[PDB]
């Protein structure tokens, strides 16, 4: 009767407050102070912050933010939004917090360095044009995030056209180079994960006339078409870039591949996945709605 | 629509002044017409800076932490209580009214 | 689909001391949820016929609440 005894022991003297914040510390009864107290009391001020508190413990940061956002320890919730790689509520915490401009460019462009560690380049790009306003970088970034035209716009605006022939072009026939030995790649995955399906799709049929990698090989084929398909919004913007700069050799080669990979794995679906986890034997899904290829070239 | 490419080649035929930001309004009334709700406000905010339909258009694309990022860093926290919060009041009823109709 | 922005709507709703509707929200969407995992092998006894996907991994719940 825990509950009952923090609520007994909710209606007492001032002094007895210590042992109820440490039963409830206990027992993990931080919502149930909150129910018993209202906000407007810095009892409930308290809870929400060893709540908060609590949550760091757990690496849930972003809600203790929350939660010493709700309170007012507007640092913590800070620090828990800079933990957890939340550059908005960040922001939105030292703007409330009233910070000086030079005193958060730092901060801002360290942000930017902990969202390009989360893979996120855009949001990295766009947190140093707000805070740092540095273009350069941006576009670095940009260019390294496929962001091919964001970058380009941002060049001009800028007036940078020494980025466009030294680092754009260069980068986008790098980047057309990489989709060549990726496409590559995929192609002799998929053929060898298919021909290994196939020996022991065999060796288990000869043992049934006369272990379970099969259904391994499965799944590895579905995440390489899952791969390629989703392959097709980056191949489709890499090919408008490359078509733009009047490279065309490039740009075809890659169309050509890519039509080749698709297909043969188009034709090749119905052959392996021949109709526990049935997304093993269920044949995965080709969204063909989506545009890739460059009917500029054609 | 393609706003992207309209503002790369604009800028190759250097131009200056505030026509350029009329004509951004004008995109981004294109693009939220797409229903592009952040691209429109995105593009109101670097071409004409105009931060309260930004954050307005964002309010309307469901999108909120930025809304609030814009607000605190204007200081415009009459739109907190006056849009920011019944827009949000109005997004989650307009869920409750989603749900039950999809039950 | 409805996931991403339930999820999001319940972080802005308990962010600003609204999580009296967040909760309505939260245990409505657990119905709706529930009742359509519930019944998906009737609905498609085994694209017609075939069952659709559903995104368990995409998190909706404001585990704060709870």
Same mark, same amino acid.
């Given at each position: 009767?825990y ?41 409930y ?6 709540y ?26 800070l ?13 939105? @915490? ?6 000086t ?9 360290t ?30 970034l ?5 962001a091919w ?18 680092n754009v072009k ?17 192609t ?10 196939? @020996? @022991? ?12 990698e ?8 579905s995440? @390489? ?10 191949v489709?913007?890499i ?28 034709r ?18 080709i969204?063909?709605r ?5 009917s500029?070239?054609?």
């Amino acid at each position: 009767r825990y509950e009952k005894a923090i609520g007994h022991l909710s209606k007492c003297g001032p002094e007895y407050f210590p042992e109820c914040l440490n039963l409830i510390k206990d027992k993990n009864l931080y919502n149930e102070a909150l129910k018993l107290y209202s906000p407007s009391s810095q009892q409930y001020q308290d809870i929400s912050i060893a709540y908060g508190e609590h949550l760091m413990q757990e690496h849930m940061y972003e809600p203790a933010g929350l939660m010493f956002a709700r309170c007012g320890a507007h640092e913590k919730a800070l620090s828990a939004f800079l933990t957890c790689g939340n550059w908005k509520q960040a922001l939105c @915490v030292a703007a409330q917090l009233n910070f000086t401009k030079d005193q958060l460019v730092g901060l801002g462009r360290t942000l930017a360095g902990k969202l390009v560690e989360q893979r996120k380049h855009i949001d990295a790009a766009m947190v140093l044009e707000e805070c740092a306003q540095d273009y350069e970088e941006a576009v670095l970034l940009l260019l390294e995030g496929a962001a091919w035209e964001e970058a380009l716009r941002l060049v001009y605006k800028y007036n940078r056209l020494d980025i466009i022939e030294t680092n754009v072009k260069p980068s986008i026939l790098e980047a057309q180079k990489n989709y060549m030995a990726f496409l590559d790649s995929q192609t002799a995955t998929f053929s060898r994960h298919k021909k290994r399906l196939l @020996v @022991v799709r065999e060796l288990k049929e000869q043992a049934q006339q006369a272990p379970l990698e099969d259904l391994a090989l499965l799944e590895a084929l579905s995440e @390489v078409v899952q791969n390629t398909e989703n392959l097709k919004d980056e191949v489709y913007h890499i090919l408008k870039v490359l078509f733009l700069f009047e490279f065309d050799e490039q740009g075809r080669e890659l169309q050509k591949a890519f039509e080749d990979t698709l297909q043969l794995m188009e034709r090749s679906l119905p052959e392996i996945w021949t109709l526990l986890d049935a997304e093993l034997f269920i044949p995965p899904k080709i969204n063909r709605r989506t545009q890739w290829k460059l009917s500029l070239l054609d």
